[PDB]
Design a protein around this ligand. Sequence first.
Ligand SMILES: N=C(N)NCCC[C@H](NC(=O)CCC(=O)O)C(=O)O
Ligand SMILES: N=C(N)NCCC[C@H](NC(=O)CCC(=O)O)C(=O)O
Ligand SMILES: [K+]
Ligand SMILES: [K+]
Lengths: 440, 440
Amino acid sequence: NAWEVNFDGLVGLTHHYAGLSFGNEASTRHRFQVSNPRLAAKQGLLKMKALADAGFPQAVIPPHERPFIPVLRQLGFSGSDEQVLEKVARQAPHWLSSVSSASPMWVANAATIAPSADTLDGKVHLTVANLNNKFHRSLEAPVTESLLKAIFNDEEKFSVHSALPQVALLGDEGAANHNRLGGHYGEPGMQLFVYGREEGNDTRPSRYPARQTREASEAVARLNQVNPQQVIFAQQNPDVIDQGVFHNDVIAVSNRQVLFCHQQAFARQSQLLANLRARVNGFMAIEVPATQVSVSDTVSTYLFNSQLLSRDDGSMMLVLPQECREHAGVWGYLNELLAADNPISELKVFDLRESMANGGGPASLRLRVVLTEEERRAVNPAVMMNDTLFNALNDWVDRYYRDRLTAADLADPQLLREGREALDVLSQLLNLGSVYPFQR
Amino acid sequence: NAWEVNFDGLVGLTHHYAGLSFGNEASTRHRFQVSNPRLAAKQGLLKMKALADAGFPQAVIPPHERPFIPVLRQLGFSGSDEQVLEKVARQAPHWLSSVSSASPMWVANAATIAPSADTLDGKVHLTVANLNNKFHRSLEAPVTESLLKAIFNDEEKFSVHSALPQVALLGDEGAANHNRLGGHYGEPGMQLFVYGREEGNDTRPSRYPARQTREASEAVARLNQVNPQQVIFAQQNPDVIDQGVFHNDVIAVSNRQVLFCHQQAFARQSQLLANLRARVNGFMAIEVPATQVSVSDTVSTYLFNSQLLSRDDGSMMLVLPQECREHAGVWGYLNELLAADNPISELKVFDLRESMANGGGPASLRLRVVLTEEERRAVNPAVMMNDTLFNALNDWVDRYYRDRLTAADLADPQLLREGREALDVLSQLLNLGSVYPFQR
Ligand SMILES: N=C(N)NCCC[C@H](NC(=O)CCC(=O)O)C(=O)O
Ligand SMILES: N=C(N)NCCC[C@H](NC(=O)CCC(=O)O)C(=O)O
Ligand SMILES: [K+]
Ligand SMILES: [K+]
């Protein structure tokens, strides 16, 4: 008898728009706009707090060390931190952005989770995602591993595995391409791993990259010791990737017996839904036809990067980003879905404009971890969301986050200091110890 | 007053043909043929010994730990070494080959070298190549770094840098894409970094991959502290890459004031040669027209993956692979070049069939390191080629290397043991200590 616990990423203070993710249309379209770090973190914390107060287990995962000077050094720039910062700013300012992204905030890509009810050894397994496709994102893995081990520290209940080798052949984007269908969270579930490409397969996107490879997905399934009979691999529809769906969570989401997805989500969709129907009792596929919502509208509103939550009476709630309400067509469809006879009996909207401008909605900011009562108790209590942490995190944000930020500001030695201090204090607040590289 | 010292790779015991390198036509064409590890090693040692006896400073770099079980475990396969070996063999035998390749033998891709005469701090710099394009090759970096630090141990004379981050954006293939033109080895030289692609540049191969990126090349130049006025970056002709030239040393080679290269080697070749002529005193470009030798014949014979050595009297010798003599056209051209009035006054041919079948000729098996008398003296004496080491290495090969091997054999637990013991013995022979992962 376990519960699904949502772990959201606390937006970092270097949050900015750099258009680093080709294939992520929001990122590319918001290229150099001014960002609001303070506001970004605030928006995220409100969603966290809201869901928490609504009775949905909520926790937080802290931001990373940014700017990340170690990697700049690795790239040949030497001297003291400030000196490297200076040199890079004047010689290769584009790298500055690459090592100063608040991207780890999208914890949906942090790792892939395997609830103890689906593993061979009966433990909760978490495999860090290499995020190799995007350089700025590939830097997250090491620190993310340190953070996950600092939060899920009971090694008798949790097994954190290191990321797969950093090569395109094993591109892994984590939970964002993962799905879990079944009855109650606590019972053994059916894991659906979605991938973009595989060796020897000519079926693959031709305009935008397929960040996830089947080879990676299969390795993670092994690493997480997922029972072979509870795993299924499906290929994302290449056509929809070429339109902006860089992660499965941008065109489909699962929860309990329901798989809410667009009609053009997968290749051989009919075979997959039939397979799920036969392998998952009570399976309900809610397909949205291109007729009611175009893939284009899907990518801009992020109706599928929503959180599908279970209410105590079995009914479900759809957590959506504000742009879903601001789009007549999609909002109209969501309400039709709401009124229709199905599990979706409530719509909840949040303003996550800062995150959405970089291609991340409600789901992208959270990592679902199904935990038993005993496992829930073994999680670092300091990261569980509640009044105390909420007020503390908001005060922390007001003390260190700026209201405005631009790539140009990333060179400011002052920003570097504020960030180091902010993280130092945060590590104490969250009882993580010296988890960041700069603290060692 | 320094000398160029050639460091060759001692072929490993797991040498086999797996067709793992798309873009490397030899590798692809010899896909699953049976290999002869013992012979492979012997062929290479003969070339080493011959050049050594001819008066050309020669050294050796040992093979790596193969099969590399740690990576298989990182891929989700658990249990004892033999258990992992078994599971992988039966579940994903293709991985077995990826972690059992003797690829590190091609040390021309081991790192990028910067002789003390070209560095800002006056030291010899070596930056390990990430070899990120090919998974099987990308595994080399860590051990390669350990080996280079065990050979070039005098930290006051040598600076070994770690490989660039492992992402396509920074694909680095080392010295194979490097060149150095100037007067005497000991004088400051002009380094020419050849790359296949760069961000924002539409000019790039469309069939085969461009393993080297300008971004990487620029970073290595920084890492190696190369004087800015002694550096030039040039792009490989994308058309020639799409024909099998996956490394610059498959289409061009430099030595002293000479740059021996095919006419279609670089993009904007005329401007590059004019640039070199103006910046390098006595510069001599020896261009081979498509009319005399086709790109196709260039890739099959490897006339350009030859070693261009300087004889005591300033004249030069061309070390070529057997296939250059077995090809009427190329052989005819080499002799014409030999008879023509130029530095090339001698042709030397070696049988490197085992290495050639996987796309590597004379140059691919060696890493050129220009060292001063004092730096030469600081190199681990145990790896310098001479009668003692030659006889010892041959006996070592006779004791541990098989006469035949196939991908199927890579699962043999006996192969794994032979390899571990062979390496342990070699570490002692070469006085390298516990340099391999399995020894720690
Ligand atoms: N849907 C999920 N699970 N995650 C969305 C993350 C968006 C992120 N954008 C960025 O990293 C853009 C950064 C910039 O351009 O500033 C990405 O492309 O990986
Ligand atoms: N010219 C230089 N400097 N190096 C050539 C190395 C050949 C190597 N072959 C391989 O890795 C193929 C192994 C196989 O497929 O079994 C490569 O492709 O990178
Ligand atoms: K409903
Ligand atoms: K000649």
